[PDB]
Every structure is written in structure tokens, then in C-alpha cells.
Design a binder for this molecule. Structure first.
Ligand SMILES: [Cl-]
Ligand SMILES: [Cl-]
Ligand SMILES: [Cl-]
Ligand SMILES: [Cu+2]
Ligand SMILES: [Cu+2]
Ligand SMILES: [Cu+2]
Ligand SMILES: [Cu+2]
Ligand SMILES: [Cu+2]
Ligand SMILES: [Cu+2]
Lengths: 316, 316, 314
């Protein structure tokens, strides 16, 4: 009985078009994603890994719906892939049908549907029995935003409207090394499993990056904004704690654990986003220049890759 | 000596001894008794053994429940069968190092500790022998105590929150020493493992992280149970290292991440951070039947290190 | 706009100030001299090349009122060998607009920004391409921007402290050799290579309060008297920490240190994110000794994140 509306997901950090304040009532929003396993270069030294992704990107695209809409996803696992995948949504309640029904082997496809009853930004990631850590730390995760029917509100209940929105997915990678110390390459994901588990148990990442690779959000790929623009930055980490910080700016309004029924925190310099969570920060640029966006464990940002840039224009 | 007295018999986790959410009488002296027990314990599927230091023979120690402004009187017994000096620190107590400077007992002795529970919330209690604190805490000597508001739990709006079931999930990080051959080492006595224990703790990387003392301790047969419609409170603690609870398929409807009840709970949490040395409480109402997993959301720590349990929910 | 000059003191102590502003907006002037020097951080005599503001780790705590202007005269004497560039989490924009603020040995620069947001903020070195090395070498501190009307509890009522202490927690990554022994270098430049290798392990060899193991114990223990209201500013420019007052509590806590937000009550332990400064308010009710620790007990009692509070009274 509910009207359906198709959406075309875009590669992060960008987000598909949508209305902050819903212009209708509940609806069934239809999304589509194609799982893609592929080699990926994550740093400047040509370090390669077998990434497992949603739509060929790390992180997966940001989905945006409104409180009480129905999210319908068509997940496709082409026969070009070699592994089983089972998507999991933190915004949903229950098993969504059961592993047997959600699970998708190479050459299969399935449709999921659940009601987004809670407003906020949530993490979605793969959860294949016995290999959860592996898929998640291979890039198989993203986030979905469930906006309150009439947009975001400040601590006073007054509206907060953003002019721009970016989705920064933080990914921790655990690239296995040999005896010498050199990183290792593999022909297929499976051959990497053995060493991958061993590397993950060290609990020490070799790389921590935004949008899939070192520098992915710097240079000409830097995020953009103009003096006076209100920007919303959705940040997620599906497996490890992170602490975002906007160098030269602040988090005017922050939902560190990303759930909008809770009023936001003000004037945050840095905020902690727990592993397995998505967070959202709201900031209004008052000056031009270059603003870095980092994980404030500076070793993780400047050594392992967790840093990006914000190019802001306008007159000083 | 003016206050009425009541005796309570502690039970083994994840269960909690009988109690009233809404206090039925005024301040009382609640009497508890615990026997320290040093013993070999198997913590994983591979039969790995360690010398555990426990309160009442379990890891974690039992959950003590009292009401705000009651007096907690604990009789701590260290039988001569043990070999080490022990004591106990309550984060709920004031002065005397949480009562740690007053509860030093050698094997063959016993002591009675008493303090007023002036602050509502869940607190961690752990052993703190001078010179060997981390060693005892990471050997399993820690638990938690809940000081309920005299009027029970309330939501972010001041309305009562009543739970039908309560479970105490204690997360424990173990640092089992390995030899040059990469194998886990065994010992004749606790003190015989000190040197290696300290060297293993300084790596800051746990070999195991478990719920209720061992891998799978809360899975399968020993899975937590609930029925559709039941409100469940889950008290979760970690005496030494940060943790991030997540109920797969569910949420934290009302959460006190740092566990202090005078602070309004956070709503719709997908995952929440409980700091090392803190006890947290999450309230959830099951809507769909099935097996819900309860994990530490650093998926490597949960699925590779043991921090994962199960929730068997019945109903339609 | 009026200008006053204030003299900074070595932490854990804080320069005198008013909790409630007695005047309107002003320009508070501070001066700091960078100082690279060898430093012993543990009782085993382990030495490192510390990069510091005013010769101490952490740097001194600066205190101003919301909307005051902070003007800092940063001096990098020629007796140093590295270039430095200060960064303030309290400031908006990249301070140095018309001119660069980096300062090579033998140069100085003046910095000025408006403290528009109340709370405690981290300030630390941020040199192009060596940020983590300087920050983990001690070059960081904090600045408190008090609300004009002083602190308030969750009910909007005033909170006044009798004492204030600044505890800077520092994580060090001292490089080891083949045999597992800490390495020593002649200058900070010679250590760079091994330093980056040590930091990449993400595992500190030392985590200390006020620059060294035990720096806040014994004769240097923090002091208070029963009945006194104490405010403890705690910062960590690079790694998460979880303060805990053994035998006490955080009656009022601003874990992420921002005052426009009501504090949390009755905290046993609170998480302060890396790159953040937090503040805890407590009223001592009993005499005796109290420990102040990072509640990852291994980091506290094995790595050095522990200090003492000697309290007198009835
Ligand atoms: Cl910064
Ligand atoms: Cl999950
Ligand atoms: Cl303690
Ligand atoms: Cu997958
Ligand atoms: Cu998850
Ligand atoms: Cu003990
Ligand atoms: Cu403790
Ligand atoms: Cu510097
Ligand atoms: Cu910073």
C-alpha cells in the first residue's frame, strides 16, 4: 500500500540526493548493490589487498531514508565473486529472515526489507558465519542514515539544516607480512585467509584509511565547502574505535554515537566513535583555507593513513 | 547498628540474586559473603589453562545488588588453601582506596567490610593488592555491584523502566604467556607464573577476551534466555580494558554507558563504549523471537578472541 | 580592546585566575619558549629527547574567559635543532593567515585567536610531516576557556573550586634494540627512524603523568584538604585515557571537556578521547591518600599512569 521510490547510490564520500525534511509520509525506498571482490591498492607503496566491497567501493555507499520508511535492498552477488556474503544492518530489528534467507553465494541475489524505526546513522556490514572479522576488515561495511521525519534539531529543539553532507568511512586493514617484513600479495581472497586471521589477532592495524586508501580524501579529492556553509559529516567505523577531529574547526553539534533521539553535544574538539558505530558531526565554516580531518590518534592519522583534507573557499 | 539487616545469597553469573527493583523498605544493612578461590581454569576450546584468582570461584565474581543508601556489609574469606594475599576495592565506596586498604587478608583469614552505597549505578569491584594490582585483576578477580535508585530505573523523561530479566555479563581480558615455540605455558602455582604474566601484560595485547570466564561460556546451552515482550537489563563490566557491547539484531533502547543512574540514559544505541574500570547497563525489549548474539564490537576481539555470547528468544 | 600579560607556571599547578570574570573581554598575553632536551622518564634511568613548551611535559595550562583573545608569543631559541609549529584546538581557522607560524631555531612568532568556545582544549605541536613524533615526544598541553559566569552543574547552579590541578598524560614510544634494551641517541634527529618504527607499533613503552613515572607521587603528590572542591583537568593529545580517582569519584565530569554541555554525575571512571582534554570536579570527604590512575591497570601500574593525592582533615 506504501508508495515506492528508487534511489541511485553514489560512491562515497558523496551522498545520493534526498530531502532533510521529508516531503511525504512513510515510503518504501528501493536500493540496489552489487558485491564486488577485487584487488585494491591502499597506500603509496603499491601495497595490494583483496578487498570485499559493496558497489566496488570502500566504504560502501551511504543510504538515506526517513524514520519509519521501509528500506528495501536488492543485494546481488555475481558469479565473478568467489565468496559467500551476508549483509547485516544495525538499523534493523531481528534476523531479517534468517541467515539461510539473507545469505548470498556467488551467482545468487536476494532482496531485504526492514522498517527503519529508529532515527540516526547506523553501520551496516557483512556478517558471514565464522568469517565476520575478515570481511569487515576487508572493506565490507558502510552506513545508512535514518533522518527524523522533519530533519535534524539542535539541543534546544530548533532545526539544523545542512548545505552539504559527506560520508567518511574509516577502515582498518591488517595486511600480513612475511619474515623479511615485506607485505604479502595473494591471487585470490581465500589464499589470504590463513595469514589474515593471524594478522588480525595482533589487534594492530597496518593501515587505517578514509575512503579506501591513504590520501583518498586529499589532493584533488579533498572534501569541499564554502565559508558560511553548514556541513554534516557522517563518520563510521565498523570494527575499531576512532576519534574524529577537524583541524582548525570543531564539531558544533555532534552525535558521537549517532542516534538523533538524543540531543547533540556542543563545541566538541574531538569525539569518540566506538567500533561498530556511526557518528555525525555538524559544523559551519567561518573561514577559508585548508582544514584537515583526522583520527586524533596522530600516529594512526599521519603514519597509518587516517587523514583527509577540506578545501574551503570564500573571503577571509 | 540501628539499621535493620537482611541476608542475601550470591549466585553465579550471568544470573543475579533475588531483589526488588523498587525498594520495599528503607535503608538496610545488606549482608554478603564471598570466598576467594585460586584455581586452574580452562578458558578456551583448545583446553588452554590458567591460574585464575576468583571471588566465590567464578569469573567474573557475582553481581551484588543493593539500594541507594543501604549499607553494604561484605564478609570476605581467604581460606588457607589459597596462597596469596587478596583484598577488595569497590568503586562504589568512598575513602580507604575503595576499601582496598582495609581488606587485606592472607590465606586462613577473613575480614568484614562495610560502606554506604551513596551513589546509584553499576560499579566495578576488583582486587587491588599493592604491587600486584593488574596481575590479580587480569587473573579474574573482579565483579560488579548495582546500587539501584530507591525508586528503580527511569527513562530520559523520568518515567519508570521495569525489567523482567537481568543478566550480568563480565568481560575478561586474559594475557596468557607463550614460549619461544609459540605455545601457551602452564605452571605449578600462581606465584610461579608472575614473571611471564607481567611480560605478557606489558604487550597490551590480550590472548583472550571472554564473557563469563571462557570462550563460548554464554553460547549454546548456557545462552542467555528471554521471551518476546520481556524487558531485559544487561549489566556489562570490564575492570581493565575498554569494551563496546552490541546486541546483534537488537539495540540498547536505554543505555547508561558509564553506568551512573542519576544521568539520563542514552536512547537507541547500536553500540556503546564502556571504559576500562567501568560497569555499564543496557535496557532492551525483545520484539522478534530468535537467537540474538551479544558481542564486543571490535569483531576481531569478539569472533577471534572469544568476546561473544548468545541470546535465545522465544515467542511469535 | 584591553591587554593583560600573565605568567605561566609549571604543571600540575595553574596560574592564578578568576572563575567568574571580573571584567569584560580582553587580550590575554602568554609567552612560551620551546625547549628540546634529554629527559629521564622512569626509575630505570631511561632517557629520551623531549620536545617541550617551557621546558616541561606537559606544557603549561593557559586560562582565559570565553570571548577573550589569546595572544601567544612562541619562541624557538637557536639552541634547538628542529622547527616547530603550535596548533590550538580552541582556535578557529588556521591562525597564521597572512604569515606562516612555523618557527625554525632562532625565530619567534606571535599568535592570536578568539576563544569563542568554553571548555578545556588540547594544544600541541603540528609540524608539517612530523606531527606524531613531536606530540609523542611531549610537545602538547591544554588551555582552559572558562564560561564568563564560571562553571555550572547540571541544574544550572554554580560550581566553584578551591583547587585546580592539570594532569597531562603522555604516551612514549622509546625504541628498543636487538636485545630489547632502550636505545639512546645524541640528538633528536638521530632517533627519527627508530621513533617512527616504535610509534607504528601503536604500543607505548611508557604512559606517564607530568612527564615521568612517579612524577606526581611522594613529595610531588597532589594535595587537598577534606571539604575542598578540586577541579582536575586531564589531557591526552594522542591516545585514549580513562581517569579514575581511587577511593573517590568524579562528582561532576565533562569527559570531553566542553562546558556548554551539562556535566555527567557520579562517574567512577570516564573516557577522555585522544586529542581531547577533560575536566573532573570532586569534593574530598575523607582524609588519607588517594590514587589517581588511568584505569587500564596495566598502563597505570606497569607503564606509569598513576599519581597520588595526599588529603588532610578529620
Ligand atoms: Cl589537530
Ligand atoms: Cl552485528
Ligand atoms: Cl581502583
Ligand atoms: Cu562479505
Ligand atoms: Cu555489527
Ligand atoms: Cu587478588
Ligand atoms: Cu579500580
Ligand atoms: Cu614541535
Ligand atoms: Cu590536534
Amino acid at each position: 500500500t506504501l508508495p515506492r521510490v528508487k534511489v541511485d547510490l553514489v560512491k562515497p564520500p558523496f551522498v545520493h540526493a534526498h530531502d532533510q525534511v521529508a516531503k511525504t509520509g512513510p515510503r518504501v525506498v528501493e536500493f540496489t548493490m552489487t558485491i564486488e571482490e577485487k584487488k585494491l591498492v591502499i597506500d603509496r607503496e603499491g601495497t595490494e589487498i583483496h578487498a570485499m566491497t559493496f558497489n566496488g567501493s570502500v566504504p560502501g555507499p551511504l543510504m538515506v531514508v526517513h524514520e519509519n520508511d521501509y528500506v528495501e535492498l536488492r543485494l546481488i552477488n555475481p558469479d565473478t565473486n568467489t565468496l559467500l556474503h551476508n549483509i547485516d544492518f544495525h538499523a534493523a530489528t531481528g534476523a531479517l529472515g534468517g541467515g539461510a534467507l539473507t545469505q548470498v553465494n556467488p551467482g545468487e541475489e536476494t532482496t531485504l526489507r526492514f522498517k527503519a524505526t529508529k532515527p540516526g546513522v547506523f553501520v551496516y556490514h557483512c556478517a558471514p558465519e565464522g568469517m565476520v572479522p575478515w570481511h569487515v576488515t576487508s572493506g565490507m561495511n558502510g552506513a545508512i542514515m535514518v533522518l527524523p521525519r522533519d530533519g535534524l534539531k539542535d539541543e534546544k529543539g530548533q532545526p539544523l539544516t545542512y548545505d552539504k553532507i559527506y560520508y567518511v568511512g574509516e577502515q582498518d586493514f591488517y595486511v600480513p607480512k612475511d619474515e623479511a617484513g615485506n607485505y604479502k600479495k595473494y591471487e585470490t581472497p581465500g589464499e589470504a585467509y590463513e595469514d589474515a586471521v593471524k594478522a588480525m589477532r595482533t589487534l594492530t592495524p597496518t593501515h587505517i584509511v578514509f575512503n579506501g586508501a591513504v590520501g583518498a580524501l586529499t589532493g584533488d579529492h579533498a572534501l569541499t565547502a564554502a565559508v558560511g556553509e553548514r556541513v554534516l559529516v557522517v563518520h563510521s567505523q565498523a570494527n575499531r574505535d576512532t576519534r574524529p577531529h577537524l583541524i582548525g574547526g570543531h564539531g558544533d553539534y555532534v552525535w558521537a554515537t549517532g542516534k538523533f533521539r538524543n540531543p547533540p553535544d556542543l563545541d566538541q574538539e574531538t569525539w569518540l566513535i566506538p567500533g561498530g558505530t556511526a557518528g555525525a558531526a555538524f559544523y559551519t565554516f567561518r573561514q577559508p583555507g585548508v582544514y584537515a580531518y583526522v583520527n586524533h590518534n596522530l600516529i594512526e592519522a599521519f603514519e597509518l593513513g587516517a587523514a583527509g583534507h577540506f578545501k574551503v573557499t570564500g573571503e577571509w
